[PDB]
From Swiss-Prot:
Name of the gene encoding the protein in the UniProt record: LOXL2
Catalytic function, reaction form: L-lysyl-[protein] + O2 + H2O = (S)-2-amino-6-oxohexanoyl-[protein] + H2O2 + NH4(+)
Induction info: Strongly induced in hypoxia. Direct transcriptional target of HIF1A.
Binding site for Ca(2+): D228, L229, E401, D403, N406, N407
Domain comment as written in the entry: The fourth SRCR domain plays an important role in optimizing the catalytic activity of the lysyl-oxidase like (LOX) catalytic domain.
Modified residues (2',4',5'-topaquinone): Y368
Residue span relative to the full protein: 322 to 762 of 774
Biological role stated in the UniProt entry: Mediates the post-translational oxidative deamination of lysine residues on target proteins leading to the formation of deaminated lysine (allysine). Acts as a transcription corepressor and specifically mediates deamination of trimethylated 'Lys-4' of histone H3 (H3K4me3), a specific tag for epigenetic transcriptional activation. Shows no activity against histone H3 when it is trimethylated on 'Lys-9' (H3K9me3) or 'Lys-27' (H3K27me3) or when 'Lys-4' is monomethylated (H3K4me1) or dimethylated (H3K4me2).
Name of the featured protein: Lysyl oxidase homolog 2
Regulation: According to some reports, it is inhibited by beta-aminopropionitrile (BAPN). According to another report, it is not inhibited by beta-aminopropionitrile (BAPN). Specifically inhibited by a mouse monoclonal antibody AB0023, inhibition occurs in a non-competitive manner.
Outcome, altering H309A: Loss of enzyme activity
One Gene Ontology cellular component: nucleus
């Protein structure tokens, strides 16, 4: 069956921004006359107790797109928040008033088979797991090989410390209490939704770990907040065009690797690249600032843009066959991360200009306009046809977010050979499943 309401953002199951399925599109509810009784109608609909809290003002993060409901006024007797009386004009409403709930839910009371060990912070440590070894109950560690944010998220969730902020593959700097210095779990990969590290895929007590620095064990760092990046779909829709650019203006772009491979043999003096340009306006809609993983030492000067780029692979840009295999070669752009404009009265902070600190503030967005170099897919080699355009933000889960189900954007693309039409542009998971089907057929 298809649910008509869901929670996004927010760390604990049963907590988050209320979003509702209306006209095949998910969309938020404005917080005017948001009340506890209505809130607890969504808590009951999702099968938890009832609202501790009727959260207002997007405190658990913002949405983008349609604000569907407004001034909800449930009686308390409705089987679903889509039955309560509501005011359908949200015009005075924006996405700093997206409502949210904190439902009463059971806490699985205490954790005894998993712990964080070492470190001065309750919120971080090497992750250790209780096992049985030769009769004794001992604490061992987890293989660090391919230990990422997603697994880290499952640990922090299981331990009740909110989100993951970091994951570590090799930890040698953490002391703690006596262990066994022996890897005890390994090969762990989590989907993200698991309720305990052990419920992810892992090999069992046959714990193949490599021999190296990854044998010390994975650690996490957890936080009660996290950023949430979203691409602005309406805008790649409004800003898309073709340009065939003489090669003599793409000298910079060539060396910074912004062209597909055929460009090597394209005539500098006389040649084209056909460039599908567009604007990437990435919002930070989560609960804290988005920040690059590394400090200044790792940032790399972008010759074309003439500023430092703190994230070497911020996006995947691709044009795809309808089956899903790339028809273009696509690109892995790198990004200066700054606040170009903010919502409402929020104050711009991060700036790239003078080796400035980089990041995207809560409530702001970072816009890489269509005319800037590398905002394209090179399409010189691509024949006319019926394709899917896709943009993935933060594609390798390199920096922690409160939601990765929204980091993908797809448009249907009809290419004449002479012009292109981008339509049905949207954030994956913003449509109903049936409707998400009709967009590929
Ligand atoms: C679909 O992808 C497959 C790759 O297995 C490719 O062979 C085929 O040409 C694609 N279909 C079309 C018509 O683009
Ligand atoms: Ca996101
Ligand atoms: Zn840049």
């Amino acid at each position: 069956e298809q649910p008509l309401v869901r929670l996004r953002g927010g760390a604990y199951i049963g907590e988050g921004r209320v979003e509702v399925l209306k006209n095949g599109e998910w969309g938020t509810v404005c917080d005017d006359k948001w009340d506890l009784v209505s809130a607890s109608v969504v808590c009951r609909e999702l099968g938890f107790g009832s609202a501790k809290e009727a959260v207002t003002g997007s405190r658990l993060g913002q949405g983008i797109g349609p604000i569907h409901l407004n001034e909800i006024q449930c009686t308390g007797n409705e089987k679903s928040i889509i039955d309560c009386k509501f005011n359908a004009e949200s015009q005075g409403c924006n996405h700093e008033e997206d409502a949210g709930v904190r439902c009463n839910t059971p806490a699985m009371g205490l954790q005894k088979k998993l712990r964080l060990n070492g470190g001065r912070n309750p919120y971080e440590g090497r992750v250790e797991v209780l096992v049985e070894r030769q009769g004794s109950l001992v604490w061992g560690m987890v293989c660090g090989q391919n230990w990422g944010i997603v697994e880290a998220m499952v640990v922090c969730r299981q331990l009740g410390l909110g989100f993951a902020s970091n994951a570590f593959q090799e930890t040698w700097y953490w002391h703690g209490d006596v262990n066994s210095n022996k890897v005890v779990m390994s090969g762990v990969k989590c989907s993200g939704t698991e309720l305990s590290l052990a419920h992810c895929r892992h090999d069992g007590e046959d714990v193949a770990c490599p021999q190296g620095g990854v044998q010390y064990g994975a650690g996490v760092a957890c936080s009660e907040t996290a950023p949430d990046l979203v691409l602005n779909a309406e805008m790649v829709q409004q800003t898309t065009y073709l340009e065939d650019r003489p090669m003599f203006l793409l000298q910079c772009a060539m060396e910074e690797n912004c062209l597909s491979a055929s460009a090597a043999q394209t005539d500098p003096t006389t040649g084209y690249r056909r460039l599908l340009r567009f604007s990437s306006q990435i919002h930070n809609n989560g609960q804290s600032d988005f920040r690059p993983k590394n400090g200044r030492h790792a940032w790399i000067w972008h010759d074309c843009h003439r500023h430092y780029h703190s994230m070497e692979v911020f996006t995947h840009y691709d044009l795809l066959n309808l089956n899903g295999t790339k028809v273009a070669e696509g690109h892995k752009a790198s990004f200066c991360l700054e606040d170009t404009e903010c919502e409402g009265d929020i104050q711009k902070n991060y700036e790239c200009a003078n080796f400035g600190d980089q990041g995207i503030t809560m409530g702001c967005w970072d816009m890489y306009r269509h005319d800037i170099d590398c905002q394209w897919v090179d399409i010189t080699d691509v024949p006319p046809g019926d394709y899917l355009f896709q943009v993935v933000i933060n594609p390798n889960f390199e920096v922690a977010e409160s939601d990765y189900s929204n980091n993908i954007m797809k448009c249907r693309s009809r290419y004449d050979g002479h012009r292109i039409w981008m339509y049905n542009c949207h954030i994956g998971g913003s449509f109903s499943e049936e409707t998400e089907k009709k967009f590929e057929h």
